[PDB]
Amino acid sequence: APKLEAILGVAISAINGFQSGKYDELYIIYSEFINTLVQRPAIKQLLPVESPDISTTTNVDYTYEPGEEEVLNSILPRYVETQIYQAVLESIASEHS
Amino acid sequence: FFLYTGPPHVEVAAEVIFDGIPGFPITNSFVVAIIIDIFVIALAVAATRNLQMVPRGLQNVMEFILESLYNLFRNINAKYVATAFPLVATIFLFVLFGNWFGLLPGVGSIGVCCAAQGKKLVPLFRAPAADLNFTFAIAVISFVFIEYWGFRALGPGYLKKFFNTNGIMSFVGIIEFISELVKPFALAFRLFGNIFAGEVLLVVMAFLVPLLLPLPFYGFEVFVGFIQALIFALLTYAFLNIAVT
Amino acid sequence: HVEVAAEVIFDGIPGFPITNSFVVAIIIDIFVIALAVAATRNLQMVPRGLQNVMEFILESLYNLFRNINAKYVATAFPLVATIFLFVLFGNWFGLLPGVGSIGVCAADLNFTFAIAVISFVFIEYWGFRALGPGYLKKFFNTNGIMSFVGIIEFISELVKPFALAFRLFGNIFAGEVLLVVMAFLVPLLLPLPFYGFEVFVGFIQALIFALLTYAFLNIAVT
Amino acid sequence: TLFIAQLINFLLLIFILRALLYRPVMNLLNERTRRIEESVRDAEKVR
Amino acid sequence: NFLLLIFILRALLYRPVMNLLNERTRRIEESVRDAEKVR
Amino acid sequence: EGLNLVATALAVGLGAIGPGVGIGIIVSGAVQAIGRNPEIENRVVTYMFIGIAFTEALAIFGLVIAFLIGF
Amino acid sequence: EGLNLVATALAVGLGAIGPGVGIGIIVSGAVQAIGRNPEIENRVVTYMFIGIAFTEALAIFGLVIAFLIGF
Amino acid sequence: EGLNLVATALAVGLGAIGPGVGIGIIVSGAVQAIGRNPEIENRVVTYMFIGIAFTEALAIFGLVIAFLIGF
Amino acid sequence: EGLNLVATALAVGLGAIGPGVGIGIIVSGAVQAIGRNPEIENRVVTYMFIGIAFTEALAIFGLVIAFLIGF
Amino acid sequence: EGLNLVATALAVGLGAIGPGVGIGIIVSGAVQAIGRNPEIENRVVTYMFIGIAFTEALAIFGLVIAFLIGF
Amino acid sequence: EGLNLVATALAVGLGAIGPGVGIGIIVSGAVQAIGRNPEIENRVVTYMFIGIAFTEALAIFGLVIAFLIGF
Amino acid sequence: EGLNLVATALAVGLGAIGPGVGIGIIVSGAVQAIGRNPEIENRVVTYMFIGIAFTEALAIFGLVIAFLIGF
Amino acid sequence: EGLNLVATALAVGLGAIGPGVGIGIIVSGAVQAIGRNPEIENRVVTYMFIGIAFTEALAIFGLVIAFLIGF
Amino acid sequence: EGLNLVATALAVGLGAIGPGVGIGIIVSGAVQAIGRNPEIENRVVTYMFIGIAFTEALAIFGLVIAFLIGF
Amino acid sequence: EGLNLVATALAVGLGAIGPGVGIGIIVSGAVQAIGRNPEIENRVVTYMFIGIAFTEALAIFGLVIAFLIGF
Amino acid sequence: PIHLEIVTAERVILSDDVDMISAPTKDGRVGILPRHAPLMTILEPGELDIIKNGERTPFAVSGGFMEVL
Q: Is the pair L, E in contact (3+ CB pairs within 8 Å)?
A: no
Task: Tell me how far apart the alpha carbons of residues C149 and C160 are, in angstroms, rounded to a whole number.
Answer: 15
Rounded CA separation D36/I70 (Å):
55
Cβ-Cβ contacts under 8 Å between M and O: the total is 134
The answer to whether the beta carbons of residues I33 and I44 sit under 8 Å apart is: yes
Please judge whether K37 and P29 are an interchain contact, meaning their C-beta atoms are less than 8 angstroms apart: yes
> Is the pair K, I in contact (3+ CB pairs within 8 Å)?
yes
Cβ neighbours of J9 in L, within 8 Å: 6-11, 14, 65-66, 69
Vertex C149 angle, CA C144 and C155, to 5°: 125
As a whole number of angstroms, the distance between CA C131 and CA P4 comes to 57
Are I and C neighbours with ≥3 CB pairs closer than 8 A? Answer: yes
Q: Do O33 and N29 touch (CB under 8 A)?
A: no
Q: How far is B10 from chain F (nearest CA, A)?
A: 17
Count of residues making up chain A:
97
Query: By three-state DSSP, how is residue J1 classified?
Result: coil
Q: How far apart are CA A75 and CA A48, in angstroms?
A: 11
For residue H6, give the nearest of G10, G12, G18 by CB distance.
Answer: G10
CA gap I65, L50 in Å, rounded: 49
Q: How many residues does chain I have?
A: 71
Q: How many CA atoms lie within 13 A of C16 on its CB side?
A: 11
Which one of C61, C68, C69, C158 would you mutate to disrupt binding with K, by most K Cβ within 10 Å of its Cβ? C68
**What's the N-to-C CA distance of chain I in angstroms?**
15
Q: Hey, is B6 helix, strand or coil?
A: coil
Chain H hits for I66, CB-CB cut-off 8 Å, are 65
CA distances from H42 to H47, I47, K11, K35 (A): 9, 20, 42, 20
Strand, coil or helix: what is B176? Answer: helix
Query: Does residue D41 sit at the E interface (CB-CB below 8 Å)?
Result: yes
Q: Which residues on chain F are in Cβ contact (under 8 Å) with G41?
A: 43
The residues near G45 (Cβ < 8 Å, ≥ 6 apart) are: B245, F47, G30, G34
Partners of residue L43 in chain N, C-beta under 8 Å: none
Q: What is the DSSP letter of A29?
A: E
Query: In a 3-state reduction of DSSP, which class is residue B17?
Result: strand
- Give the type of residue at L68: L
Q: How far apart are the C-alpha atoms of F19 and G19, rounded to whole Å? A: 8
Helices (H), chain C: 20-40, 50-53, 60-68, 77-83, 88-94, 109-126, 150-169, 172-184, 194-221
Whether I13 sits inside 8 A of H8 (CB atoms) is no
Helix, strand, coil percent values for chain N (each to nearest 5) = 90, 0, 10
Resolution attained, angstroms: 3.2
Interchain CB distance below 8 Å, K24 and I20: no
Out of B76, B189, B234, the one facing F61 most closely (by C-beta) is: B189
Q: Do D43 and E23 touch (CB under 8 A)?
A: no
Task: Report CB contact under 8 Å: F46, B192.
Answer: no
Mark yes or no for CB contact L17/J19 under 8 Å. no
Helix (H, G, I), strand (E, B) or coil at C38: helix
Size of interface F-J (CB pairs under 8 A): 145
The SS3 assignment for O36 reads helix
Residue P49 backbone dihedrals phi, psi, to 5 degrees: -120, 145
- Cβ within 8 Å, pair M53-C152: yes
DSSP character string of L34-47? HHH-SSSTHHHHHH
Report CB contact under 8 Å: E19, C114. no
Supply angle C-alpha K50, K56, K58, rounded to 5: 110
Q: Are F27 and J26 in contact (CB under 8 A)?
A: yes
* Chain C nearest CA to E36, separation (Å): 26
Q: How far apart are CA E11 and CA E24, in angstroms?
A: 20
Beta strands in B41-160 (DSSP E): none
Contact M24, K22 (CB under 8 A): yes
Q: For residues G29 and G23, what is the distance between their CA atoms, to the nearest angstrom?
A: 10
- Cross-strand bridge partners of residue P21: P32, P50
Rounded distance between C-alpha atoms, residue P36 and residue I46, angstroms: 25
| H or E stretch covering P32 | strand P30-32
A41 pairs with which residues across the strands?
A31
Residue of P nearest to K33 (CA): P28
List of residues 6+ apart from A24 with CB closer than 8 A: A18
Method: cryo-EM
Say whether residue J46 is in contact with chain B using an 8 A CB cutoff.
no
- Residue of chain C with shortest Cα separation from K67: C6
d(CA N47, CA L34): 11
> What does the alpha-carbon distance between residue P52 and residue P35 come to, in Å, rounded to a whole number?
17
Secondary structure letter of residue C56 according to DSSP = I
CA-to-CA distance for H58 and B93, rounded, in angstroms? 46
Run of H or E residues at G9:
helix G3-36
Cβ neighbours of H25 in I, within 8 Å: 21, 24-25, 28
Asked whether the beta carbons of residue C54 and residue E6 sit closer than 8 angstroms, the reply is no
Question: Cβ of C123: how many Cβ atoms within 10 Å?
Answer: 20
Q: Which contacts (CB < 8 Å, 24+ apart) does range M49-53 have?
A: M49/C153, M49/C219, M50/C153, M50/O27, M51/M22, M51/M26, M51/O23, M51/O24, M51/O26, M51/O27, M51/O28, M52/K54, M52/M19, M52/M22, M52/M23, M52/M26, M53/C149, M53/C152, M53/C153, M53/C156
Q: Is residue B186 within a helix (H) or strand (E), and if so which, with residue range?
A: helix B175-207
* Cβ atoms of residues K16 and K56 within 8 Å: no
d(CA B73, CA F15): 31
Test mutation, G31, G32, G37, G39, chain A, max A CBs within 10 A? G37
**DSSP state at residue G39:** G
With an 8 Å Cβ cutoff, is I42 touching chain P?
no
Taking CB atoms and an 8 Å cutoff, what residues of chain C touch M56? 156
* C-beta atoms of J71 and B205 within 8 A: no
Task: Give how far P10 is from chain I: nearest CA, Å.
Answer: 30
Neighbours of chain K (3+ CB pairs under 8 A): C, I, M, P
Residue-level length of chain G:
71
* Closest residue by Cα to residue N28 from H42, E25, J69, O22: O22
Chain C neighbors of D27, CB-CB under 8 A: 48-49, 52
Q: Within the 9-48 window of chain M, which residues sit less than 8 Å (CB to CB) from chain K?
A: 9-10, 12-32, 34-36, 38, 48
Interatomic CA distance for residues F22 and H24, integer angstroms: 10
Nearest to C58 among E1, E3, E16 (CB): E16
Provide φ and ψ at B192, rounded to 5°: -60, -50
Q: Is A59 on the interface with F (CB under 8 A)?
A: yes
Q: Please report the DSSP string for M3-16 in residue order.
A: HHHHHHHHHHHHHT
Q: Chain centroid to CA D10: how far?
A: 21
Cβ contact, residue pair C215, K56, below 8 Å:
no
